[PDB]
């Protein structure tokens, strides 16, 4: 197995994770993924603070309770011109990206490279953290605890 995890800069500890392809994480896998990063699925208030510090993406992703996109600037193809933490209301489907929250991060923007999946456990997968600047960190292990996700 090989799994690539593209991670963004953290904003008030909140970051975005894309696994392999766009929108391929379930809600259970997302919770396990954040846990592997010693993080949690963000609360809405945590996400709102991150947005205020400059966090935005053009990707739907899990937080605690909902699927959201943080938007600073209005774009027609990113939450249909909405700004703020846009909550996904209507979808047939169950697989998105995820957000995670790391309490130990700096309070503002942190674009240093993520170098580990610290809480990952023993397993057969090559897990590679890919940062936006291309710097990579790989380890062998596993983070999924539901067979359905494997």
Ligand X SMILES: CC(=O)N[C@@H]1[C@@H](O[C@@H]2O[C@H](C(=O)O)[C@@H](O[C@@H]3O[C@H](CO)[C@@H](O)[C@H](O[C@@H]4O[C@H](C(=O)O)[C@@H](O[C@@H]5O[C@H](CO)[C@@H](O)[C@H](O[C@@H]6O[C@H](C(=O)O)[C@@H](O[C@@H]7O[C@H](CO)[C@@H](O)[C@H](O)[C@H]7NC(C)=O)[C@H](O)[C@H]6O)[C@H]5NC(C)=O)[C@H](O)[C@H]4O)[C@H]3NC(C)=O)[C@H](O)[C@H]2O)[C@H](O)[C@@H](CO)O[C@H]1O
Task: Please give the annotated binding residues for hyaluronan, written as ranges.
Answer: 22, 59-60, 86
Smallest separation (angstroms) from ligand X to the CB of 103: 26
Distances (CA, A) of 28 to 50, 101, 123, 134: 23, 16, 18, 28
11 lies in the site for ligand X, by CB under 6 A? no
**17 vs 30: CA distance, rounded Å:** 9
Smallest separation (angstroms) from ligand X to the CB of 75: 5
Which tokens belong to 47? 């996400």
- Candidates 35, 75, 113, 145; binder of ligand X (CB under 6 A) is 75
CB contact at 8 A, 7 and 55:
no
Measured from the CB atom, the residue of 89 and 147 that comes closer to ligand X is 89
Size of the site for ligand X (CB under 6 A): 10
**26 vs 96: CA distance, rounded Å:** 7
What is the contact mask toward ligand X in residues 77 to 96, using x (rule: CB under 6 A)? xxxx----------------
């Amino acid at each position: 197995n090989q799994i690539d995890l593209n991670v963004t800069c953290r904003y008030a500890g909140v970051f975005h994770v894309e696994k392999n392809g766009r929108y391929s994480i379930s809600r259970t896998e997302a919770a396990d993924l954040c846990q592997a990063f010693n993080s949690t699925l963000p609360t809405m208030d945590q996400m709102k603070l991150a947005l205020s510090k400059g966090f935005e993406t053009c990707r739907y992703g899990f937080i605690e309770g909902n699927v959201v996109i943080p938007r600073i600037h209005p774009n027609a193809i990113c939450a249909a011109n909405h700004t703020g933490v846009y909550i996904l209301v209507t979808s047939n489907t169950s697989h998105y990206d995820t957000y995670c929250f790391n309490a130990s991060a700096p309070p503002e923007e942190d674009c240093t490279s993520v170098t580990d999946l610290p809480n990952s456990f023993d397993g057969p997968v090559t897990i590679t953290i890919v940062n936006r600047d291309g710097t990579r960190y790989s380890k062998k292990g596993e983070y999924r605890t539901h067979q359905e996700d494997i």
